[PDB]
Design a protein around this ligand. Structure first.
Ligand SMILES: *[C@@H]1O[C@H](CO)[C@@H](O[C@@H]2O[C@H](CO)[C@@H](O[C@@H]3O[C@H](CO)[C@@H](O)[C@H](O)[C@@H]3O)[C@H](O)[C@H]2NC(C)=O)[C@H](O)[C@H]1NC(C)=O
Ligand SMILES: *[C@@H]1O[C@H](CO)[C@@H](O[C@@H]2O[C@H](CO)[C@@H](O[C@@H]3O[C@H](CO)[C@@H](O)[C@H](O)[C@@H]3O)[C@H](O)[C@H]2NC(C)=O)[C@H](O)[C@H]1NC(C)=O
Lengths: 242, 287, 73, 740
């Protein structure tokens, strides 16, 4: 997380750290599934237990953590690992059920009526261990509170100058300040863009950290997140059948 | 080769000498690598070719890494190198490493080392049907008074006297579990003796050692009392008593508690167990 | 004895450790972090020797994780 | 890119190639994470340390500042990658391995001839050359003809070198398709016992292999056997395509524990009634792993000289180097191909016993000596000295050992007497004013536990050089008789004066006194020094039973009893002495043969050496082996007789395969080795009944796997091995922790 502050115990009990060929993050679903980005996990996708999955801790360098082992990795078939992040979503199945406790609770899947909380300019939260404002990976968990950006306003800010055409798509949502300074960065991919359901006082993930400007937090550039609600039947079909 | 996602680890070998006896002299560090791994040749040359003299020579013939040290220091001196697994091997067993004075091989030191904790190398890689084949040599795991799908009436007597025909039958209480190289050791105390062959003067309050391979999924928790019967092994412990290996020809079953045995469902089954123990413990297999 | 519940506890309503006919036990998943499904966990010892729920089922309840629950103010 | 420019810019600050090399070593990242200043303190030249430290500090600072920044892209994930390495300005590595030259031959061709040949596999096309030699028409060079070998479809199987049983193994045969068409292949592993395999072996798996591509196939297997299994992967193309290939390889599967070796030797003496019947208790080690079905191997011999130096001993095709069973990478170890082979030839030459062995042994002997000469000459320095390792400092001790051995071997290997004359001249330049020789980096130290190390080392080194210089006198002819031979003889006399006063002054160690006695006996020292050195050595002798040896005092356990070599019993095994004792008594035995000849002290000493040898060949290590075999060969020449002495021995044991009993006829004429050793059960005791008119030797080897090490294994030396995963180690390498 770029330009944020350090989280305290219990703030993000669904945060998952994933280590393999890439440094990435994830969000726990139920007690045996991890929600993350497809581009971050496609590396070593056919090796089931290749990923080092660590959760329930606030420090990346910590020797004490809760270990989880992956039984299988599911990548969305719509994703194309050439260039672009269309349909950037992946589900990781954990071999053993996680011990839900004070520092480990899953994030809720978004309801179909939860878009009343994902409105433009409303505040959302992103969290993860990424490149900080000083230029190095975070030694402890960081987070930002950022507002959602209009889809038309986000599309206009991309495809130029260096970005390829069709980078923004209907499966995405955006967030970030107009002036920059609050954004995700390299290492936060798969992290959960969470929103507060004030009617139930519960948190749910609405976006998955995907891509953005190569220069993190640049003014006039916004972070792009994979929208979860489009894949709710796809998530339920994999969890129920596999 | 290409891709395949190879497994890589990093070694660290430290040597030092306590006391001034056997001072200096050329010593050889013999490291037996874990199964499937071979030491990376590139990093090994950095120990000898650089201006830093961390080793004088190295040989990589076989699964062994031979390191030539000119002298063994009093304070720790450590050498590290990468190792890469060519063919994936899971459930890896610990291996030995040995440091010895070349011209005085009586001064030596051998030690075991294992894979890093919470590493995927300790997890299995067997396919579903292969795992079922793998435990064909492993002891059967059952809770108290549990009936198998093929266990017809009189199954305990059939196991003891027909097949695999038990040679020793004990009733022990598990005291403590120790982890040895590729084996788990359970220190037990015998509470009742049913039959024995090689283990003469086996009695109550006598202590024995029961071992099982690390691959098998059986675990004997301390504080519980088990019925154990099988065939006597060939090894002995520190006091001279024989040791026992638990495999597919061994019958292990935790004995039911008083509260569970008088339950309506298990009362009939608990009677079969005690009737068998009195029958076999008194008259043996002379049916 | 009642079958232990994953991520849950069992409470004797009738009396300490009484498991005989018509005795009542109350299952409970670990509070806050878990919630119970299928049934509400009230079980009574039936005449056939099986613990039966209020609905008449002989199998255990299931505890389900409660998602969300952040410590932010 | 930016890292390469900055490092090369730092290298540009040093113009000298010495400074550049010291700087280039600094920027190279050590495998283990040692601190830069801590690492820089090791280099031995301060003029090299100053640029090494500056470049190492700049490289680490630059590498950590640039760390975590690389791999730019629109993605928000971060690839884990190791730290950038300097791309060397040294020469690039051109390929150096090529398939061996098959069809390298010469054939008698009359007018014309056709050769049926089987083509080795490869992807590179090769050309065949030819030379015709005719007595009447002369030489002719044939024009090259091309032969292109190619593969339509290739199966490649890899398996580990060593696998413990019950380890989960996923073997990955790779299907290589060179055809321009997509190919569907049916692959399967043939069923074989001892392997838990999918479908019990022979489970077909359909794999599509694209054109010009490779596809690994995953099979799961776990070995349950304890020996070795040959597994065969079969691949066959479906449809009407005849493509297909099969690979069969042997997978070595080992037992769970770690190998433990127990070697005990027993004296066979039927002359006394106490040795006619003896019992071997077997093994009952508490650390031995269960199962396994281990065996105990027994070697009974009454023909000790021929078994040690014959076709089954020092003159084996692989020589004693394969019997000693230690790595021989060092330079001194090269003489294990030379000094034992030379001693074996000396025994057979002086006893005229070559006719008994097969005649190919002489070819084995000259091959071993030429192999040692060819290897040891790689360590020769420009000035005639020898170094322990290549590009290492010269060792005075090793230079002496080479001269002592290569002086005898140069005639049969085609050596140069001029080079050995150059070698001895360098040794003479190392003699100090006192007459002692000095080594700036000796290979052996040995003299430990016992104090006064400088006195023992200088005397033992001086005596070792003089023994080497005396053997070097055999090289000289008429050319060096006046200029060089007079210098060497004067140098030996000057050093003998140093050894003479140190022997007369006394207080020398047992090892230093033994080599001094042989030095003053090989060289014809004056009778006063020759006698006092013998009397000084005999005062340190230890005698028990019919054995005579020289040992060392390992302090005292507070107030302890004095008679240390008191216990002895022919029914008990002979304790294996340390290497220092073997080398000391070997020099004393060599001194005894020259001073007194074949005597009762020579018999008692040599009988101890004969009963101190290891199971399958040598002694404790290389240095003690070459000197003990040199001493025993000299004794066996002196004590050789034509009598048919032998013994009768009967061994029996109740093993797991029933009661087995063997009755053996042993005598001096036999050659008994590996093929004659007996097999008994590891746990079962063995009963031996001996009878005859001569003494013998019985050795037992018990090797088994243990699940734990002894509690007294690591009293002095210590070794600790740890291993970490790559992701855990790399993040720990780039770690900035306990700070901010
Ligand atoms: C022989 O094997 C090759 C490699 O597996 C097969 O190539 C694959 O062919 C399919 C069909 O043409 C390609 O899918 C198509 O890709 C284009 C873009 O190139 C897209 O516009 C289409 O909608 C469709 O998705 C596929 O990409 C290609 N594989 C790769 C790696 O590019 C080939 O088809 C095989 N031959 C036969 C006769 O099936
Ligand atoms: C080791 O044992 C063998 C026999 O197991 C000994 O060979 C035996 O030697 C004796 C004396 O030389 C031979 O005695 C002869 O026996 C015949 C038959 O009774 C008799 O007619 C002769 O007058 C003479 O007494 C005996 O034949 C011979 N055994 C065999 C099978 O040839 C051998 O001497 C023993 N060696 C040692 C070193 O103890």
């Amino acid at each position: 997380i770029y330009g944020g502050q350090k989280a305290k115990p219990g703030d993000f009990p669904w945060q998952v750290l994933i280590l393999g060929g890439t440094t990435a993050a994830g969000a726990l679903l139920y007690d045996n599934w991890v929600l993350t980005a497809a581009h971050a996990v496609y590396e070593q996708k056919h090796d089931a237990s290749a990923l080092d999955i660590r959760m329930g801790t606030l420090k990346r360098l910590s020797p004490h953590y809760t270990q989880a082992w992956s039984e299988a990795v599911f990548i969305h078939e719509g994703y194309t690992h050439d260039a672009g992040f269309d349909n950037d979503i992946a589900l990781i199945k954990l071999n053993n059920k996680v011990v839900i406790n004070s520092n480990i609770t899953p994030i809720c899947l978004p309801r179909k009526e939860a878009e009343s909380f994902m409105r433009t300019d409303d505040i959302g939260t992103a969290s993860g261990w990424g490149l900080t404002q000083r230029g190095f990976l975070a030694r402890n968990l960081m987070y930002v509170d950022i507002p959602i950006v209009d889809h038309q306003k986000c599309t206009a800010a991309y495809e130029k100058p260096p970005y390829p055409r069709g980078s923004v798509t209907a499966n995405m949502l955006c967030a970030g300040l107009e002036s920059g300074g609050k954004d995700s960065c390299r290492g936060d991919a798969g992290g959960a863009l969470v929103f507060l359901d004030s009617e139930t006082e519960r948190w749910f993930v609405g976006g998955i950290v995907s891509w953005g400007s190569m220069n993190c937090g640049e003014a006039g550039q916004y972070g792009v997140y994979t929208k979860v609600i489009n894949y709710i039947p796809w998530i339920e079909n994999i969890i129920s059948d596999f | 080769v290409v891709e395949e996602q190879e497994s890589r680890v990093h070694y660290t070998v430290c040597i030092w000498r306590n006391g001034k006896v056997g001072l200096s002299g050329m010593a050889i560090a013999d490291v037996t690598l874990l199964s499937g791994f071979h030491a990376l040749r590139a990093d090994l040359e950095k120990l000898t070719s650089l201006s830093d003299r961390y080793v004088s020579h190295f040989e990589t013939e076989g699964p062994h890494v031979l390191l030539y040290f000119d002298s063994v220091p009093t304070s720790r001196e450590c050498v590290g190198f990468e190792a890469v697994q060519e063919v994936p091997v899971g459930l890896v067993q610990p291996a030995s490493a040995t440091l010895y004075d070349y011209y005085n091989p009586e001064r030596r030191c051998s030690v075991f080392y294992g894979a890093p904790s919470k590493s995927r190398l300790l997890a299995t890689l067997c396919s579903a049907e292969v795992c079922q084949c793998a435990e064909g040599k492993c002891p059967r795991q059952r809770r108290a008074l549990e009936r198998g799908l093929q266990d017809e009436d009189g199954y305990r007597m059939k196991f003891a006297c027909y097949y695999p025909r038990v040679e020793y039958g004990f009733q022990v209480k598990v005291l403590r579990e120790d982890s040895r190289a590729a084996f788990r050791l359970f220190e037990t105390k015998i509470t009742q003796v049913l039959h024995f062959t090689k283990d003469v003067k086996a009695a109550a309050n006598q202590m024995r050692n029961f071992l099982v391979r690390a691959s098998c999924r059986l675990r004997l928790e301390p504080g519980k009392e088990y019925l154990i019967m099988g065939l006597d092994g060939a090894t002995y412990d520190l006091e001279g008593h024989p040791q026992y290996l638990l495999d597919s020809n061994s019958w292990i079953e935790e004995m039911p508690s008083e509260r569970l045995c008088r339950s309506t469902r298990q009362r009939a089954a608990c009677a079969q167990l005690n009737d068998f123990l009195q029958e076999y413990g008194t008259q043996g297999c002379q049916v | 004895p009642p079958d232990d519940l994953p991520s849950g506890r069992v409470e004797y309503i009738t009396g300490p450790g009484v498991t005989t006919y018509k005795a009542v036990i109350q299952y409970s998943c670990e509070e806050t972090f878990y919630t119970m499904k299928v049934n509400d966990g009230k079980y009574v010892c039936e005449a056939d020797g099986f613990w039966t729920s209020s609905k008449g089922e002989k199998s255990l309840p299931v505890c389900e994780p409660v998602c969300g629950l952040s410590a932010r103010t | 890119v930016n890292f390469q420019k900055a490092i090369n810019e730092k290298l540009g600050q040093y113009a000298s190639p010495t400074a550049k090399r010291c700087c280039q070593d600094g920027v190279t990242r050590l495998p283990m994470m040692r601190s830069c200043e801590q690492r820089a303190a090791r280099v031995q030249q301060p003029d090299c340390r100053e640029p090494f430290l500056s470049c190492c500090q700049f490289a680490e600072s630059l590498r950590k500042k640039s760390r975590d920044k690389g791999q730019a892209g629109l993605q928000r994930a971060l690839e884990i990658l190791q730290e950038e390495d300097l791309i060397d300005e040294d020469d690039i590595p051109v390929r150096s391995f090529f398939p061996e030259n098959w069809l390298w031959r010469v054939e008698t061709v009359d007018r014309f001839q056709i050769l049926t040949l089987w083509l080795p596999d490869s992807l590179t096309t090769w050309e065949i050359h030819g030379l015709s030699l005719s007595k009447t028409k002369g030489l002719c060079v044939a024009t090259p003809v091309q032969l292109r070998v190619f593969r339509e479809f290739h199966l490649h199987l890899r398996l580990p070198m060593s696998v413990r049983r019950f380890e989960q193994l996923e073997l990955r045969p790779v299907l290589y398709n060179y055809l321009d068409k997509n190919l569907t292949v049916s692959v399967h592993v043939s069923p074989v016992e001892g392997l838990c395999l999918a479908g019990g072996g022979g489970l077909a798996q359909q794999v599509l292999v694209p054109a010009g591509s490779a596809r690994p196939v995953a099979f799961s297997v776990v070995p349950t056997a304890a020996a070795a299994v040959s597994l065969k992967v079969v691949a066959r193309g479906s449809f009407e395509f005849p493509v297909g290939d099969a690979v069969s390889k042997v997978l070595q599967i080992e037992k769970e524990g770690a190998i433990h070796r127990e070697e005990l030797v027993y004296e066979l003496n039927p002359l006394d009634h106490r040795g006619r019947t003896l019992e071997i208790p077997g093994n009952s080690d508490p650390n031995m792993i269960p199962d396994g079905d281990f065996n105990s191997y027994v070697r009974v011999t009454a023909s000790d000289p021929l078994d040690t130096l014959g076709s089954e001993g020092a003159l084996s095709p692989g020589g004693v180097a394969s019997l000693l069973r230690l790595p021989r990478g060092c330079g001194e170890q090269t003489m294990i191909y030379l000094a034992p082979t030379l001693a074996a030839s000396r025994y057979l030459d002086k006893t005229e016993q070559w006719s008994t062995l097969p005649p190919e042994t002489k070819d084995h002997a000259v091959d071993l000596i030429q192999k040692g000469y060819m290897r040891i000459q790689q360590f020769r320095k420009a000035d005639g000295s020898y170094a322990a390792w290549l590009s290492r400092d010269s060792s005075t001790w090793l230079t002496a050992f080479v001269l002592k051995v290569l002086s005898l071997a140069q005639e049969q290997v085609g050596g140069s007497p001029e080079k050995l004359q150059e070698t001895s001249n360098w040794l003479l330049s190392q003699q100090q004013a006192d007459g002692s020789f000095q080594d700036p980096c000796p290979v052996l130290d040995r003299s430990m536990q016992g104090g006064l190390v400088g006195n023992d080392e200088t005397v033992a080194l001086t005596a070792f050089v003089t023994i080497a210089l005396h053997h070097g006198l055999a090289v000289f002819q008429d050319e060096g008789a006046e200029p060089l031979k007079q210098r060497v003889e004067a140098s030996i006399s000057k050093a003998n004066s140093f050894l003479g006063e140190k022997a007369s002054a006394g207080l020398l160690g047992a090892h230093a006194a033994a080599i001094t006695a042989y030095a003053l006996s090989l060289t014809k020292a004056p009778v006063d020094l020759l006698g006092v050195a013998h009397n000084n050595l005999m005062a340190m002798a230890q005698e028990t039973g019919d054995n005579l040896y020289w040992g060392s005092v390992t302090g005292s356990q507070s107030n302890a009893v004095s008679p240390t070599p008191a216990p002895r019993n022919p029914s008990d095994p002979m304790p294996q002495a340390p290497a220092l004792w073997i080398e000391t008594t070997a020099y004393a035995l060599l001194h005894l043969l020259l001073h007194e000849g074949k005597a009762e002290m020579a018999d008692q000493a040599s009988a101890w050496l004969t009963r101190q040898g290891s199971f399958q060949g040598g002694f404790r290590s290389t240095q003690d082996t070459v000197i003990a075999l040199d001493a025993l060969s000299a004794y066996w020449i002196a004590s050789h007789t034509t009598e048919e002495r032998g013994l009768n021995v009967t061994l029996s044991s109740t093993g797991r395969n029933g009661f087995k009993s063997h009755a053996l006829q042993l005598n001096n004429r036999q050659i008994r080795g590996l093929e004659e050793e007996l097999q008994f059960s590891l746990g079962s005791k063995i009963n031996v009944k001996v009878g005859g008119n001569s003494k013998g030797t019985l050795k037992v080897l018990r090797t088994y796997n243990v699940l734990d090490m002894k509690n007294t294994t690591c009293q002095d030396l210590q070794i600790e091995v740890t291993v970490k995963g790559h992701v855990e180690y790399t993040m720990e390498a780039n770690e900035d922790y306990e700070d901010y």
